[PDB]
Amino acid sequence: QDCCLKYSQRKIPAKVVRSYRKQEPSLGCSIPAILFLPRKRSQAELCADPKELWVQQLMQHLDKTPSPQKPA
């Protein structure tokens, strides 16, 4: 249902993220995005640009201990 419309203007450190998911372009949602899921429930999911180097780097570190992803 919900989806990312904008991207983080701030880098986040891996210490606060538990996992990520991918958002592909769709009818409800027109941009691709990376969704970073927080360790603390006091925090929201964070939308981020897939092309940014820090985003790629974080995903790559998180992938050392991967979580399930959205089918497709």
Side-chain angles (χ1 to χ4, degrees), residues 2-72:
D2 285 11
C3 42
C4 297
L5 318 178
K6 298 185 200 211
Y7 303 137
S8 191
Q9 301 177 10
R10 311 275 190 281
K11 314 202 171 174
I12 54 154
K15 89 188 221 310
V16 304
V17 178
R18 97 174 179 256
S19 58
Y20 77 86
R21 299 299 185 279
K22 290 197 194 222
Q23 157 175 313
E24 291 177 312
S26 81
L27 295 166
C29 318
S30 68
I31 59 170
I34 308 309
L35 280 70
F36 290 114
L37 298 195
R39 294 161 63 69
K40 313 210 141 183
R41 301 303 185 185
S42 76
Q43 303 170 354
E45 312 178 334
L46 179 73
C47 300
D49 188 346
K51 312 183 164 186
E52 286 188 331
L53 294 184
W54 72 270
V55 176
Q56 286 167 51
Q57 175 170 290
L58 181 53
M59 283 172 96
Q60 285 164 22
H61 165 89
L62 289 168
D63 284 339
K64 301 204 291 106
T65 59
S67 61
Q69 302 287 316
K70 296 286 212 174

Coordinates of all heavy atoms in Angstrom, one line a residue, unseen atoms left out:
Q1 N 0.8 -1.2 0.0 CA 0.0 0.0 0.0 C 0.9 1.3 0.0 O 1.0 1.9 -1.0 CB -1.0 0.0 1.2
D2 N 1.5 1.7 1.1 CA 2.2 2.9 1.2 C 3.5 2.8 0.4 O 4.0 1.7 0.1 CB 2.6 3.2 2.7 CG 1.4 3.8 3.5 OD1 0.3 3.7 3.1 OD2 1.7 4.3 4.6
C3 N 4.1 4.0 0.0 CA 5.3 3.9 -0.7 C 6.1 5.2 -0.6 O 5.5 6.2 -0.3 CB 5.2 3.5 -2.1 SG 3.7 4.3 -2.9
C4 N 7.4 5.2 -0.9 CA 8.2 6.3 -0.9 C 8.0 7.3 -2.1 O 7.9 6.8 -3.2 CB 9.7 5.9 -1.0 SG 10.0 4.8 0.5
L5 N 7.8 8.6 -1.7 CA 7.8 9.7 -2.7 C 9.0 10.6 -2.7 O 9.2 11.4 -3.6 CB 6.5 10.5 -2.4 CG 5.2 9.8 -2.0 CD1 4.1 10.9 -1.6 CD2 4.8 8.9 -3.1
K6 N 9.8 10.6 -1.7 CA 11.0 11.4 -1.6 C 12.2 10.6 -1.0 O 12.0 9.5 -0.5 CB 10.7 12.6 -0.7 CG 9.6 13.5 -1.1 CD 9.5 14.7 -0.2 CE 8.1 15.3 -0.3 NZ 8.1 16.8 0.0
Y7 N 13.4 11.1 -1.0 CA 14.5 10.4 -0.5 C 15.2 11.1 0.6 O 15.2 12.4 0.6 CB 15.5 10.2 -1.6 CG 15.1 9.5 -2.9 CD1 15.5 10.0 -4.2 CD2 14.4 8.3 -2.9 CE1 15.2 9.3 -5.4 CE2 14.1 7.6 -4.0 CZ 14.5 8.1 -5.3 OH 14.2 7.4 -6.3
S8 N 15.8 10.4 1.6 CA 16.5 11.0 2.6 C 17.6 12.0 2.1 O 18.3 11.8 1.2 CB 17.3 9.9 3.5 OG 17.8 10.5 4.6
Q9 N 17.6 13.1 2.8 CA 18.7 14.1 2.6 C 19.9 13.9 3.6 O 20.8 14.6 3.6 CB 18.2 15.5 2.8 CG 17.0 15.9 1.9 CD 16.5 17.3 2.2 OE1 17.0 18.1 3.0 NE2 15.4 17.6 1.6
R10 N 19.7 12.8 4.4 CA 20.8 12.6 5.4 C 21.2 11.1 5.4 O 20.3 10.2 5.4 CB 20.3 12.9 6.8 CG 19.7 14.3 6.9 CD 20.8 15.4 7.1 NE 20.2 16.7 7.5 CZ 19.6 17.5 6.6 NH1 19.5 17.2 5.3 NH2 19.1 18.7 7.0
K11 N 22.5 10.9 5.4 CA 23.0 9.5 5.5 C 22.6 8.9 6.9 O 22.6 9.7 7.8 CB 24.5 9.5 5.4 CG 25.0 10.4 4.3 CD 26.4 10.2 3.7 CE 26.5 11.1 2.4 NZ 27.9 11.1 1.8
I12 N 22.4 7.6 7.0 CA 22.1 7.1 8.3 C 23.1 5.9 8.5 O 23.5 5.2 7.6 CB 20.7 6.6 8.6 CG1 20.2 5.6 7.5 CG2 19.8 7.8 8.7 CD1 19.1 4.7 8.1
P13 N 23.5 5.8 9.8 CA 24.5 4.7 10.1 C 23.9 3.4 10.3 O 22.7 3.3 10.7 CB 25.1 5.3 11.4 CG 24.1 6.0 12.1 CD 23.3 6.6 11.0
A14 N 24.6 2.3 9.9 CA 24.1 1.0 10.0 C 23.6 0.6 11.4 O 22.7 -0.3 11.6 CB 25.1 0.0 9.5
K15 N 24.2 1.2 12.4 CA 23.9 0.9 13.8 C 22.5 1.1 14.2 O 22.0 0.4 15.1 CB 24.8 1.7 14.8 CG 24.2 3.0 15.2 CD 25.3 3.9 16.0 CE 24.6 4.6 17.2 NZ 23.4 5.3 16.9
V16 N 21.8 1.9 13.5 CA 20.3 2.2 13.7 C 19.3 1.4 12.8 O 18.1 1.6 12.9 CB 19.9 3.7 13.7 CG1 20.8 4.4 14.7 CG2 20.1 4.2 12.3
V17 N 19.9 0.6 11.9 CA 19.0 0.0 10.9 C 19.1 -1.5 11.1 O 20.2 -2.0 11.3 CB 19.6 0.2 9.4 CG1 18.7 -0.5 8.4 CG2 19.6 1.6 9.1
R18 N 17.9 -2.2 11.0 CA 17.9 -3.6 11.2 C 17.8 -4.4 9.9 O 18.5 -5.4 9.8 CB 16.6 -3.9 12.1 CG 15.4 -4.3 11.3 CD 14.3 -4.8 12.2 NE 13.1 -5.2 11.4 CZ 12.0 -4.4 11.3 NH1 11.9 -3.2 11.9 NH2 11.0 -4.9 10.6
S19 N 17.1 -3.8 8.9 CA 17.1 -4.4 7.5 C 16.6 -3.4 6.4 O 16.3 -2.3 6.7 CB 16.1 -5.6 7.6 OG 14.8 -5.1 8.0
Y20 N 16.7 -3.9 5.2 CA 16.1 -3.0 4.1 C 15.1 -3.8 3.2 O 15.1 -5.0 3.2 CB 17.2 -2.3 3.3 CG 17.9 -3.3 2.3 CD1 17.3 -3.5 1.0 CD2 19.0 -3.9 2.6 CE1 18.0 -4.3 0.1 CE2 19.7 -4.8 1.7 CZ 19.1 -5.0 0.5 OH 19.7 -5.8 -0.4
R21 N 14.3 -3.0 2.5 CA 13.5 -3.6 1.4 C 13.6 -2.6 0.1 O 14.1 -1.5 0.2 CB 12.0 -3.7 1.7 CG 11.6 -4.6 2.9 CD 12.0 -6.1 2.6 NE 11.6 -7.0 3.6 CZ 12.2 -7.3 4.8 NH1 13.2 -6.6 5.2 NH2 11.6 -8.2 5.6
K22 N 13.2 -3.1 -1.0 CA 13.2 -2.4 -2.3 C 11.8 -2.0 -2.7 O 10.9 -2.8 -2.4 CB 13.9 -3.2 -3.4 CG 15.4 -3.4 -3.2 CD 16.1 -3.8 -4.4 CE 17.6 -4.3 -4.1 NZ 18.6 -3.8 -5.1
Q23 N 11.7 -0.9 -3.3 CA 10.5 -0.4 -3.9 C 10.8 -0.3 -5.3 O 11.7 0.4 -5.7 CB 10.0 0.9 -3.3 CG 9.0 1.7 -4.2 CD 8.5 2.9 -3.5 OE1 8.1 2.9 -2.3 NE2 8.6 4.1 -4.1
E24 N 10.1 -1.0 -6.2 CA 10.0 -0.8 -7.6 C 8.9 0.1 -8.0 O 7.9 0.1 -7.4 CB 9.7 -2.1 -8.3 CG 10.8 -3.2 -8.3 CD 10.3 -4.5 -9.0 OE1 9.1 -4.9 -8.7 OE2 11.0 -5.1 -9.8
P25 N 9.1 0.9 -9.1 CA 8.1 1.6 -9.8 C 6.8 0.8 -10.1 O 6.9 -0.4 -10.4 CB 8.7 2.0 -11.1 CG 10.1 2.3 -10.7 CD 10.4 1.2 -9.7
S26 N 5.7 1.4 -9.9 CA 4.4 0.8 -9.9 C 3.3 1.9 -10.1 O 3.6 3.1 -10.1 CB 4.1 0.2 -8.6 OG 3.6 1.1 -7.7
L27 N 2.0 1.5 -10.2 CA 1.0 2.5 -10.4 C 0.8 3.4 -9.2 O 0.7 4.6 -9.3 CB -0.4 1.8 -10.7 CG -0.4 1.0 -12.0 CD1 -1.6 0.1 -11.9 CD2 -0.5 1.9 -13.3
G28 N 0.7 2.8 -8.1 CA 0.6 3.5 -6.8 C 1.8 4.4 -6.5 O 1.7 5.4 -5.8
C29 N 3.0 4.0 -7.0 CA 4.3 4.5 -6.6 C 5.2 4.6 -7.8 O 5.5 3.6 -8.4 CB 4.8 3.5 -5.6 SG 3.6 2.9 -4.4
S30 N 5.6 5.8 -8.1 CA 6.2 6.0 -9.4 C 7.8 6.0 -9.5 O 8.3 5.9 -10.6 CB 5.7 7.3 -10.0 OG 6.2 8.5 -9.3
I31 N 8.4 6.1 -8.3 CA 9.9 6.1 -8.2 C 10.4 4.8 -7.6 O 9.6 4.2 -6.9 CB 10.5 7.3 -7.5 CG1 10.0 7.3 -6.0 CG2 10.2 8.5 -8.2 CD1 10.7 8.4 -5.2
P32 N 11.6 4.3 -7.9 CA 12.2 3.3 -7.2 C 12.7 3.8 -5.9 O 13.0 5.0 -5.8 CB 13.3 2.8 -8.1 CG 13.7 4.1 -8.8 CD 12.5 4.9 -9.0
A33 N 12.8 3.0 -4.8 CA 13.4 3.5 -3.5 C 13.9 2.3 -2.7 O 13.4 1.2 -2.8 CB 12.4 4.3 -2.7
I34 N 14.8 2.6 -1.8 CA 15.3 1.7 -0.8 C 14.6 2.1 0.6 O 14.7 3.3 0.9 CB 16.8 1.8 -0.6 CG1 17.5 1.5 -2.0 CG2 17.3 0.7 0.4 CD1 17.0 0.3 -2.7
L35 N 13.9 1.2 1.2 CA 13.3 1.4 2.5 C 14.2 0.8 3.6 O 14.4 -0.4 3.7 CB 12.0 0.7 2.6 CG 10.8 1.4 1.9 CD1 10.9 1.4 0.4 CD2 9.4 0.8 2.4
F36 N 14.8 1.6 4.5 CA 15.6 1.2 5.7 C 14.7 1.0 6.9 O 14.0 2.0 7.3 CB 16.8 2.1 5.9 CG 17.8 2.0 4.8 CD1 18.1 3.1 4.0 CD2 18.5 0.8 4.6 CE1 19.0 3.0 3.0 CE2 19.5 0.7 3.6 CZ 19.7 1.8 2.8
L37 N 14.7 -0.2 7.5 CA 13.8 -0.4 8.6 C 14.6 -0.2 9.9 O 15.7 -0.6 10.1 CB 13.3 -1.8 8.6 CG 12.4 -2.3 7.4 CD1 11.7 -3.6 7.8 CD2 11.3 -1.3 7.1
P38 N 14.0 0.5 10.9 CA 14.8 0.9 12.1 C 14.8 -0.2 13.1 O 13.9 -1.0 13.2 CB 13.9 2.0 12.6 CG 12.5 1.5 12.3 CD 12.6 0.9 10.9
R39 N 15.9 -0.3 13.9 CA 16.0 -1.1 15.1 C 15.1 -0.7 16.2 O 14.4 -1.6 16.8 CB 17.5 -1.1 15.6 CG 18.4 -1.7 14.6 CD 19.8 -1.3 14.8 NE 20.4 -1.7 16.1 CZ 20.6 -3.0 16.5 NH1 20.4 -4.0 15.6 NH2 21.0 -3.3 17.7
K40 N 15.0 0.6 16.4 CA 14.0 1.1 17.5 C 12.6 1.4 16.9 O 12.6 2.0 15.8 CB 14.6 2.4 18.1 CG 16.1 2.3 18.5 CD 16.4 3.2 19.7 CE 17.4 2.5 20.6 NZ 17.8 3.2 21.8
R41 N 11.6 0.9 17.5 CA 10.2 1.2 17.1 C 9.8 2.7 17.3 O 8.8 3.2 16.7 CB 9.2 0.4 17.9 CG 9.3 -1.1 17.7 CD 9.2 -1.6 16.2 NE 9.2 -3.1 16.1 CZ 9.3 -3.8 15.0 NH1 9.3 -3.3 13.8 NH2 9.3 -5.2 15.1
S42 N 10.5 3.5 18.1 CA 10.4 4.9 18.1 C 10.7 5.7 16.8 O 10.5 6.9 16.7 CB 11.3 5.5 19.2 OG 12.6 5.6 18.8
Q43 N 11.2 4.9 15.8 CA 11.5 5.5 14.5 C 10.7 5.0 13.4 O 10.2 3.9 13.4 CB 13.0 5.3 14.3 CG 13.9 5.8 15.4 CD 15.3 5.4 15.3 OE1 15.6 4.5 14.5 NE2 16.2 5.9 16.2
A44 N 10.7 5.7 12.3 CA 9.9 5.4 11.1 C 10.8 4.7 10.1 O 12.0 4.8 10.3 CB 9.3 6.6 10.5
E45 N 10.2 4.0 9.1 CA 10.9 3.5 8.0 C 11.4 4.8 7.2 O 10.8 5.8 7.2 CB 10.0 2.6 7.1 CG 9.3 1.6 7.9 CD 8.4 0.7 7.1 OE1 7.9 1.1 6.0 OE2 8.2 -0.5 7.5
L46 N 12.6 4.6 6.5 CA 13.3 5.7 5.9 C 13.5 5.4 4.5 O 14.1 4.5 4.1 CB 14.7 5.9 6.6 CG 15.5 7.0 5.9 CD1 14.9 8.4 6.3 CD2 17.0 7.0 6.2
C47 N 13.0 6.3 3.6 CA 13.1 6.2 2.2 C 14.4 6.8 1.7 O 14.8 7.9 2.1 CB 12.0 6.9 1.5 SG 10.3 6.4 1.9
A48 N 15.1 6.1 0.8 CA 16.4 6.5 0.3 C 16.6 6.2 -1.2 O 16.0 5.3 -1.7 CB 17.5 5.9 1.2
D49 N 17.5 7.0 -1.8 CA 17.8 6.9 -3.2 C 18.7 5.7 -3.5 O 19.8 5.7 -3.0 CB 18.4 8.2 -3.7 CG 18.6 8.3 -5.2 OD1 18.5 7.3 -5.9 OD2 18.9 9.4 -5.6
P50 N 18.3 4.8 -4.3 CA 19.1 3.6 -4.7 C 20.4 4.0 -5.4 O 21.3 3.2 -5.4 CB 18.1 2.9 -5.7 CG 16.8 3.4 -5.4 CD 16.9 4.8 -4.9
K51 N 20.5 5.1 -6.1 CA 21.7 5.5 -6.8 C 22.8 6.1 -5.9 O 23.9 6.2 -6.2 CB 21.4 6.5 -7.9 CG 20.3 5.9 -8.8 CD 20.1 6.9 -10.0 CE 19.3 6.3 -11.1 NZ 19.2 7.2 -12.3
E52 N 22.4 6.6 -4.7 CA 23.4 7.2 -3.8 C 24.4 6.1 -3.2 O 24.1 5.0 -2.7 CB 22.8 7.9 -2.6 CG 22.3 9.2 -3.1 CD 21.8 10.2 -2.1 OE1 21.3 9.8 -1.0 OE2 21.8 11.4 -2.4
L53 N 25.7 6.5 -3.2 CA 26.7 5.6 -2.8 C 26.5 5.2 -1.4 O 26.7 4.0 -1.2 CB 28.1 6.2 -3.0 CG 28.5 6.5 -4.4 CD1 30.0 7.0 -4.5 CD2 28.3 5.3 -5.3
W54 N 26.2 6.1 -0.5 CA 26.1 5.6 0.9 C 24.9 4.6 1.1 O 25.0 3.7 1.9 CB 25.9 6.8 2.0 CG 24.5 7.4 1.9 CD1 24.2 8.5 1.1 CD2 23.3 7.1 2.6 NE1 22.9 8.9 1.3 CE2 22.3 8.0 2.2 CE3 23.0 6.1 3.5 CZ2 21.0 7.9 2.7 CZ3 21.7 6.0 4.0 CH2 20.7 7.0 3.6
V55 N 23.9 4.7 0.2 CA 22.7 3.8 0.2 C 23.1 2.4 -0.2 O 22.9 1.4 0.5 CB 21.5 4.3 -0.6 CG1 20.4 3.3 -0.6 CG2 21.0 5.6 0.0
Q56 N 23.8 2.3 -1.4 CA 24.4 1.1 -1.9 C 25.4 0.5 -0.9 O 25.3 -0.8 -0.6 CB 25.2 1.4 -3.2 CG 24.2 1.6 -4.4 CD 25.0 2.2 -5.6 OE1 26.0 1.6 -6.0 NE2 24.4 3.2 -6.2
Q57 N 26.2 1.3 -0.2 CA 27.1 0.8 0.8 C 26.4 0.1 1.9 O 26.7 -1.0 2.4 CB 28.0 1.9 1.3 CG 28.9 1.4 2.5 CD 29.9 2.6 2.8 OE1 30.8 2.8 2.0 NE2 29.7 3.2 3.9
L58 N 25.4 0.8 2.5 CA 24.6 0.3 3.6 C 23.9 -1.0 3.2 O 23.8 -1.9 4.1 CB 23.7 1.4 4.1 CG 22.8 1.0 5.3 CD1 23.5 0.4 6.5 CD2 22.1 2.2 5.8
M59 N 23.2 -1.1 2.1 CA 22.6 -2.3 1.6 C 23.6 -3.4 1.6 O 23.3 -4.5 2.0 CB 22.0 -2.1 0.2 CG 20.8 -1.2 0.1 SD 20.5 -0.9 -1.6 CE 19.3 -2.2 -1.9
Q60 N 24.8 -3.1 1.1 CA 25.8 -4.2 0.9 C 26.3 -4.7 2.3 O 26.5 -5.9 2.4 CB 27.0 -3.6 0.0 CG 26.5 -3.6 -1.5 CD 27.3 -2.8 -2.5 OE1 28.5 -2.5 -2.2 NE2 26.7 -2.4 -3.6
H61 N 26.4 -3.8 3.3 CA 26.7 -4.3 4.6 C 25.6 -5.1 5.2 O 25.8 -6.2 5.9 CB 27.1 -3.1 5.5 CG 27.1 -3.3 6.9 ND1 28.2 -3.7 7.6 CD2 26.2 -3.0 7.9 CE1 28.0 -3.7 8.9 NE2 26.8 -3.3 9.1
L62 N 24.3 -4.6 5.1 CA 23.2 -5.3 5.6 C 23.1 -6.7 4.9 O 22.7 -7.7 5.6 CB 21.9 -4.5 5.4 CG 21.8 -3.3 6.3 CD1 20.6 -2.5 5.7 CD2 21.6 -3.5 7.8
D63 N 23.4 -6.8 3.6 CA 23.4 -8.0 2.9 C 24.4 -9.1 3.4 O 24.2 -10.3 3.1 CB 23.7 -7.9 1.4 CG 22.6 -7.3 0.6 OD1 21.5 -7.4 1.0 OD2 22.9 -6.8 -0.5
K64 N 25.4 -8.8 4.2 CA 26.2 -9.8 4.9 C 25.4 -10.6 5.9 O 25.8 -11.8 6.2 CB 27.3 -9.1 5.7 CG 28.2 -8.2 4.8 CD 29.7 -8.0 5.4 CE 29.7 -7.1 6.7 NZ 29.9 -7.9 7.9
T65 N 24.3 -10.1 6.4 CA 23.3 -10.8 7.3 C 21.9 -10.5 6.7 O 21.1 -9.8 7.3 CB 23.5 -10.3 8.7 OG1 23.3 -8.9 8.9 CG2 24.9 -10.6 9.3
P66 N 21.6 -11.1 5.5 CA 20.4 -10.7 4.8 C 19.1 -11.0 5.4 O 19.0 -12.0 6.1 CB 20.5 -11.4 3.4 CG 21.4 -12.5 3.7 CD 22.3 -12.1 4.8
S67 N 18.1 -10.2 5.1 CA 16.7 -10.5 5.6 C 15.8 -10.9 4.4 O 16.3 -10.6 3.3 CB 16.0 -9.2 6.2 OG 16.0 -8.2 5.2
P68 N 14.6 -11.4 4.6 CA 13.8 -11.7 3.4 C 13.4 -10.4 2.7 O 13.4 -9.3 3.2 CB 12.5 -12.3 4.0 CG 13.0 -13.0 5.3 CD 14.1 -12.1 5.8
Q69 N 13.1 -10.5 1.4 CA 12.8 -9.4 0.5 C 11.4 -9.6 -0.1 O 10.8 -10.7 0.0 CB 13.8 -9.2 -0.6 CG 15.2 -8.9 0.0 CD 15.4 -7.6 0.6 OE1 15.0 -6.6 0.1 NE2 16.1 -7.5 1.8
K70 N 10.9 -8.5 -0.7 CA 9.6 -8.6 -1.3 C 9.7 -9.5 -2.5 O 10.6 -9.4 -3.3 CB 9.1 -7.2 -1.8 CG 8.9 -6.2 -0.6 CD 7.6 -6.5 0.2 CE 7.0 -5.3 0.7 NZ 5.7 -5.5 1.4
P71 N 8.7 -10.5 -2.7 CA 8.7 -11.3 -3.9 C 8.6 -10.5 -5.2 O 7.9 -9.5 -5.2 CB 7.4 -12.2 -3.8 CG 6.6 -11.6 -2.7 CD 7.5 -10.7 -1.8
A72 N 9.5 -10.8 -6.2 CA 9.9 -9.9 -7.3 C 10.7 -8.7 -6.8 O 11.9 -8.5 -7.3 CB 8.7 -9.3 -8.0

